[PDB]
């Protein structure tokens, strides 16, 4: 093929033009987001059953829904969660390769089967089926400091939300604030005065506020001669508080007409009163924008900001908008980094190429070829339906160097031939390509063989690996294709003949550098000869190095991804059980001031109502948005340091309750991937007390008598809290007319809200809710003052037929796969593999009697599967590489000399990571490098590059021996010939990775990990290879 295109440069140019066009078109039509989808599909239920406890919610709604979910296609596991908030959820997780849309529709169709078996109020509110996946883009905040949160929420819902979701690329907008409602606050004392009940109020509201459907005049089956038809309309609904207050509750014979406005206060309000939000200590209304699949994050964020700026003109006085967090900035920074690294690599390639080949037109070929290979990779990525995100951009950054090598090799070989034999560029190119074409083909085959396995892993980790695998493989393939077609054509066309008979008698810098590099090459050849003369000792040394490197690699920590400074910290506040929202708000104000005391924090968002532990009036959390990375570069201004400072301040300041500041994992959708998560099921339905006792026993077994770092072993729920228990005498209640259902309605309307009807409010329907005055539902003694009607219709207080006492009850309940369950966390003690700890806990669970099982959750479900998949994939990769090399060399034993370089790269990488960890420990910084995903990617990259260099050396050595040279002489000549290109590529690649070694700022943790691994692996592997590969060749030839 190379000879074909050496004579047809314009055909090669046309092919490259088509490649460029395909790449441009692919870039134009690629989705853009910071991260791809890596988690499995999940469907949630989210039912509301007001005024209920965890046990009631669970048994009456969640178990009933759950029992009709065994049978949906591709279901892995299932869970339930109930708290004291009056709402709960059922979460269904699905096996990968399951269509999320089909799963959602099937779950909805299963829910429609049992919907009628739920409580009437649950059906009134409805159950929302949705998919847990969220393509979160931004938060939009409106702050006034003048008008209440009701006004801001209404204004947002009426003006801002509809405008944002009409923008291109927006998939969903969610308002973090309650809608408006007509609230009736009943005073039970007045009700008892008039001998009325909450049921009467609800019935009157429903009867006197209803839609009327009249019809038309002159409908179709009309009498003869009818000429006019008209629609008849009557309005039977109320729309103002004054109209609602005039509802007649009892039309007395005398005409007194007891109205609704003399037993209750009627006014517009909200529908939750549960959660409140603030921004730097002032009232706010938050909105969340979610990008649509196939949407561009940067364009959508810019359009949203423009729309908000335009809409700002019409805000009421005092209202302003702000967007404190945005995910498009990360991908923008990643793309900018890609462009900057590409420019720097081009500059460095130009510099080294001009330094070595002593001409300016030699530098033109890599510049042309590398961008075309990148564009071909982009085209392939678009064809496969992927997107532009951080991982793919990192893959581009890392593959730039290898594609640069693929061209340096050809250009250097051609220049050597031209300077040596004095041939014209066309003949020299023909000779060089005839020399290296088969080696190029074999090298690309080997690279594909080594990279394909990374696309065969399973789970979220496999999804993460697939990005790198596909992007890099496509780029490598296109680079090889270009090196076989366009690079030789460019070499034969744009180069000029070296003056014949010239010995490069240069002057000044060029002559001096030529002499010094020739001395270096001669010295290198002498050292290689010394190494070759004594072979047994060098083989012993190589085995020692390989063993030490393997040992270092094994003794490395295992992790998934390193925590990154994403620009914010989270705070979770928890107060003693039974605390009220007022105390929590005071603590939140304290936390806000403490955050204000820290310069590194830009904005603080506090939300009351729920925490990391769960929901409740004693729960709260905050989001602290940090300043820009540029403004935070000194020591102690990173996310971890800010979190530590905030935690230290909180532990000394806050009086009631405690707060903790942490940083989230790198990917929010993918939960924490650290620790051991345990689900303890109850198979026999013994009860809550038995399961709690068993959980305590298991915690003791794990902590006191196990290997689990006792500090981290703790329960992941919410301990029991005191509750009020009403005991009703059946006989006493039956003696009067109380029917136990009048009790239900009375309590449901008194101690909790009641949803009665629906009314129009300037174009949109909103709920009517009856909740009873706050003065009658504050104290335990108020419970027995409530009244319930008799059969005769008289009001009788609950005191006569009931008693109340303080008890202990559950605050939250969870089921796992259809059984009552508890959740536990843990972590290995030290140097303990997860496998043996999991076996230990399995044995402990077995020690507990039958009826109590175990189940892993989250990442532990995947970690239960052994690491055999990785071993098998790498073994198959090695076998494929061996077969490809055997085909290339037409031998069975020569390929062995190329496989022996794998330990060199492995040792280099492991030693670099260990050394940088130790150095950071000396500096006082905690360790931050592990055998994580980025380590594996970098190891694969350096291993491929080392394999390429070894393959070229062995190819050159084999041919020289066939000509007549001995094995040792052939090896010496091959090393002497390959010295220069290897030096050039190593210099370029190492200095191009250096920036990733000192990376700092956004996503800099992964950058630093890759930089360390690649830099040290490449340096050490190349240093050992340039001395040991000839030894491998000589040994393999002698032995066989």
């Amino acid at each position: 093929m190379a000879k074909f295109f050496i004579d047809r440069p314009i055909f090669a140019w046309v092919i490259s033009i088509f490649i460029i066009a395909a790449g441009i078109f692919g870039i134009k039509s690629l989705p853009v987001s910071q991260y791809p989808s890596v988690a499995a599909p999940t469907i949630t239920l989210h039912a509301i059953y007001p005024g209920a406890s965890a046990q009631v919610m669970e048994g009456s709604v969640l178990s009933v829904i759950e029992r009709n979910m065994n049978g949906v296609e591709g279901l892995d596991y299932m869970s339930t969660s109930a708290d004291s908030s009056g709402s709960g959820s059922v979460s269904l997780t699905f096996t990968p390769d399951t269509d999320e849309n089909l799963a959602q529709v099937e779950v909805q169709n299963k829910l429609s089967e049992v919907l009628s078996t739920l409580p009437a109020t649950v059906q009134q509110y409805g159950v929302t089926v949705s998919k847990a996946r969220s393509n979160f883009l931004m938060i939009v905040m409106l702050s006034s400091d003048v008008q209440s949160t009701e006004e801001m929420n209404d204004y947002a819902q009426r003006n801002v939300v509809p405008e944002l979701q009409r923008i291109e690329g927006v998939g969903q907008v969610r308002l973090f604030g309650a809608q408006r409602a007509m609230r009736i606050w009943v005073d039970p004392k007045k009700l008892q005065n008039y001998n009325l009940s909450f049921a009467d109020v609800g019935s009157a509201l429903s009867a006197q506020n209803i839609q009327i459907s009249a019809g038309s005049i002159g409908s179709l089956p009309a009498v003869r001669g009818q000429t006019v038809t008209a629609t008849v309309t009557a309005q039977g609904q109320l729309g103002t508080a004054e109209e609602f207050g005039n509802v007649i509750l009892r039309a007395n014979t005398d005409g007194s007409n007891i109205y609704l406005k003399d037993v209750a206060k009627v006014g517009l309000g909200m529908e939750d009163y549960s959660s409140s939000t603030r921004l730097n200590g002032v009232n706010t209304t938050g909105m969340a924008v979610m990008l649509s699949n196939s949407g561009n994050a940067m364009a959508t964020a810019k359009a949203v900001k423009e729309r908000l700026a335009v809409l700002e003109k019409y805000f009421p006085q005092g209202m302003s908008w702000k967007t404190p967090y945005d995910t498009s900035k990360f991908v923008e920074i990643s793309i900018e980094k890609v462009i900057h690294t590409l420019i720097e690599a081009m500059v460095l390639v130009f510099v080294v190429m001009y330094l070595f080949l002593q001409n300016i037109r030699y530098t033109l070929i890599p510049t042309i070829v590398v961008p075309i290979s990148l564009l071909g990779g982009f085209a392939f990525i678009s064809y496969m339906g992927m997107s532009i995100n951080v991982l793919t951009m990192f893959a581009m950054i890392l593959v730039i160097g290898i594609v640069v090598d693929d061209a340096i090799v050809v250009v250097e070989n051609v220049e050597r031939i031209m300077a040596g034999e004095g041939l014209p560029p066309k003949e020299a190119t023909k000779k060089a390509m005839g020399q290296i074409s088969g080696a190029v083909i074999g090298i690309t085959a080997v690279l594909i063989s080594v990279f394909v396995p990374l696309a065969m892993f399973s789970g979220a980790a496999g999804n993460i690996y697939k990005q790198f695998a596909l992007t890099m493989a496509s780029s490598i393939a296109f680079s090889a294709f270009l090196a076989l077609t366009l690079t030789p054509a460019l070499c034969a066309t744009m180069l000029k003949t070296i003056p014949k008979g010239h010995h490069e008698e240069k002057k000044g810098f060029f002559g001096w550098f030529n002499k010094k590099f020739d001395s270096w090459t001669h010295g290198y050849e002498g050292r290689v000869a010394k190494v070759l003369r004594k072979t047994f000792r060098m083989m012993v040394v190589y085995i020692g190095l390989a063993v030490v490197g393997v040992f270092l690699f094994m003794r490395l920590p295992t992790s998934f991804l390193p925590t990154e400074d994403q620009g914010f910290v989270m705070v979770s506040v928890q107060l003693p059980a039974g605390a009220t929202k007022e105390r929590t708000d005071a603590t939140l104000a304290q936390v806000t001031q403490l955050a204000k005391s820290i310069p590194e924090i830009e904005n603080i968002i506090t939300v009351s109502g729920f925490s990391f532990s769960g929901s409740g009036q004693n729960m709260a959390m905050g989001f602290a948005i940090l300043k820009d990375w540029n403004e935070r570069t000194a020591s102690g201004s990173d996310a971890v340091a800010v979190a530590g400072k905030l935690t230290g301040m909180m532990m000394g300041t806050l009086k009631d309750g405690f707060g903790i500041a942490v940083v989230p994992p790198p990917i929010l959708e993918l939960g924490n991937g650290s620790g051991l998560s345990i689900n303890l099921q109850d198979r026999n339905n013994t009860g809550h007390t038995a399961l709690l006792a068993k959980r305590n026993e298991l915690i003791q077994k794990m902590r006191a008598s196990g290997l689990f770092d006792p500090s981290t072993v703790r329960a992941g729920g919410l301990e029991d809290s005191p509750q009020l228990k009403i005991d009703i005498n059946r006989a006493a209640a039956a003696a009067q007319g109380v029917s136990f259902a009048d009790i239900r309605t009375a309590l449901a309307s008194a101690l909790s809200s009641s949803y009665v009807s629906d009314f129009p409010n300037q174009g949109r329907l909103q709920r009517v809710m009856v909740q009873a005055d706050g003065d009658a539902r504050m104290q335990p003694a108020d419970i027995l003052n409530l009244t319930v009607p008799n059969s005769s219709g008289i009001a009788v207080p609950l005191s006569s037929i009931a008693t109340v006492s303080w008890q202990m009850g559950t605050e939250q309940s969870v089921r796992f796969n259809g059984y009552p369950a508890m959740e536990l966390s843990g972590s290995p003690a030290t140097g303990v593999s997860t496998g043996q700890a999991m076996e230990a806990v399995q044995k402990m669970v077995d020690e507990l009697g039958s009826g109590y099982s175990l189940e892993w959750g989250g990442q532990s479900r995947e970690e239960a599967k052994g690491g055999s998949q990785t071993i098998a994939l790498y073994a198959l990769a090695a076998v494929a590489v061996f077969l490809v090399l055997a085909a290339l060399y037409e031998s069975w034993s020569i390929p062995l000399a190329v496989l022996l370089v794998m330990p060199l790269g492995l040792a280099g990488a492991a030693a670099g990571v260990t050394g940088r960890n130790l150095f950071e420990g000396l500096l006082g910084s905690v360790p931050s490098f592990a055998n994580d995903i980025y380590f594996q990617v970098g190891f694969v990259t350096v291993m491929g590059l080392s394999a390429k260099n070894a393959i070229l050396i062995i190819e050159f050595a084999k041919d020289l021996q066939a000509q007549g040279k001995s094995a040792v002489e052939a090896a010496l000549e091959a090393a002497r010939l390959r010295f220069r290109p290897i030096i050039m590529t190593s210099f370029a690649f190492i200095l191009g990775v250096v920036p990733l070694y000192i990376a700092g700022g956004a996503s800099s943790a992964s950058q630093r990990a890759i930089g360390t691994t690649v830099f040290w692996g490449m340096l050490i592997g190349t240093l050992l290879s340039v001395f040991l590969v000839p030894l491998f060749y000589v040994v393999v030839r002698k032995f066989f």
């Binding site: 908030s85 009056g86 847990a132 549960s274 959390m621």
Partner: peptide
């Protein structure tokens, strides 16, 4: 609106 709150805190529960 309890459902929206339920969604937000379930996600938060998972991360930490």
């Amino acid at each position: 609106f309890k459902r929206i709150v339920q969604r937000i805190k379930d996600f938060l529960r998972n991360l930490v």
